[PDB]
Swiss-Prot record:
Gene3D superfamilies: DD-peptidase/beta-lactamase superfamily. The gene is ampC. Changing residue 218 to G: Increases activity about 180-fold with respect to cefotaxime. Reduces activity about 100-fold with respect to cephalothin. Reduces thermodynamic stability. Pfam families: Beta-lactamase (PF00144). Changing residue 216 to K: Increases activity about 150-fold with respect to cefotaxime. Reduces activity about 5-fold with respect to cephalothin. Reduces thermodynamic stability. Keywords: Antibiotic resistance, Hydrolase, Periplasm, Signal. It catalyses: a beta-lactam + H2O = a substituted beta-amino acid. This is Beta-lactamase. It is found in: Periplasm. Belongs to the class-C beta-lactamase family. It comes from Escherichia coli (strain K12).
Length: 354
């Protein structure tokens, strides 16, 4: 690897690992369209298994970028429109609060205060219908952003309904397979269990538990190589030969709402580049934030910091890229450590290399 990349990565990540007590970590830097990989520590402490380029990590909310792109692909296929009312794809959702709530609102967390988590008691299709029927919005649609698994997760579930495919089958056929993400999974198959890292929470080895809309909101597991490929695909969508997938990637990086310095895409979030790190971190506190509509949405802006953070009980992930500079980073760790430290490290590395 070029010595500049080796040096900035090791000099940034080694102290991070020490300060945060991270058991294992994988990092990829994409520099002028080429990936460079780094690994440290342990995927499984007890069995002394090291982190490798084939280790699977839980992506947590980074999964939402996949959901956003899959939704974009469905738009490009003509199967859904973001202006469609939610009720077009779930006619059983008859409660009057749903009038005026569209697929865009679900995908961008602007439906009017859908909650961060689906309750654990919700299991069956009927439990989920009941949950959404009984939810009372605090705000009118399209006025405030409140980050919510129950929002984007419902978007993902409804976006695949016209296809007739399950969410997992649609994701595999329409996103993972075309991009050659052959070690990226919604459910880890037995054959790959040897590569599935354990997460660590308070010293205990843990994996994410099943839950309603888990696949759509936080369910993807992936390797550092596949995530590097995902970043490359999002940096250079025009290189993608499947027309609807190229278009869906573009749609997911469009700017639909603004709050402060941040713009909301489909799954992805964006800021204008050059960007101050403090501003990036300005968005631990669950915040209700008024949004301004971008009417119509701005197509993907190349001079952007495009990013997403993710966590599960035992894992912490971060992805960021700058399309204008052909530069990106993926950081995967098997401990959920604070987001500001992730952003600080990513910015140190990418700013050094741009
Ligand atoms: O819901 S999440 O999508 N991930 C998770 C799912 C399931 C869990 F039990 C999690 C337990 N701890 C942390 C995250 C969990 C999510 C939420 C938030 Cl407020 C921030 C990020 Cl970064 C994120 O990924």
């Amino acid at each position: 690897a070029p010595q500049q990349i080796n040096d900035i990565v090791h000099r940034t990540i080694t102290p991070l690992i020490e300060q945060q007590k991270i058991p294992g970590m994988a990092v990829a830097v994409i520099y002028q369209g080429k990936p460079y990989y780094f690994t440290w520590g342990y995927a499984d402490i007890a069995k002394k298994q090291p982190v490798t380029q084939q280790t699977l990590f839980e992506l947590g909310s980074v999964s939402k970028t996949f959901t956003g792109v899959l939704g974009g692909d469905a738009i490009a296929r003509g199967e859904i429109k973001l202006s469609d009312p939610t009720t077009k794809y779930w006619p059983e959702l008859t409660a009057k609060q749903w009038n005026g709530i569209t697929l865009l609102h679900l995908a961008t967390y602007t439906a009017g205060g859908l909650p961060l988590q689906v309750p654990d008691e919700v299991k069956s299709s009927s439990d989920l219908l009941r949950f959404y029927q009984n939810w009372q919005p605090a705000w009118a649609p399209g006025t405030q952003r409140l980050y919510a698994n129950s929002s984007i997760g419902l978007f993902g579930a409804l976006a695949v309904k016209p296809s007739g495919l399950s969410f997992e089958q649609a994701m595999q056929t329409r996103v993972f397979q075309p991009l050659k993400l052959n070690h990226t999974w919604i459910n880890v198959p037995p054959a790959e269990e040897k590569n599935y890292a354990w997460g660590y929470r308070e010293g205990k080895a843990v994996h994410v538990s099943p839950g309603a809309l888990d696949a759509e909101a936080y369910g993807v597991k992936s390797t550092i190589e596949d995530m590097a490929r995902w970043v490359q695909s999002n940096l250079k969508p025009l290189d993608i030969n499947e027309k609807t997938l190229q278009q869906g990637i573009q749609l997911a990086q469009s700017r639909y709402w603004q709050t402060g310095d941040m713009y909301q895409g489909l799954g992805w979030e964006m800021l204008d580049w050059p960007v101050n790190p403090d501003s990036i971190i300005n968005g631990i506190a669950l915040a209700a934030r008024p949004v301004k509509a971008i009417t119509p949405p701005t197509p993907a802006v190349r001079a952007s910091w495009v990013h997403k953070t993710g966590a599960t009980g035992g894992f912490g992930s971060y992805v960021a890229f700058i399309p204008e500079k052909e530069l990106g980073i993926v950081m995967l760790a098997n401990k959920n450590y604070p987001n500001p430290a992730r952003v600080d490290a990513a910015w140190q590395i990418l700013n050094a290399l741009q």
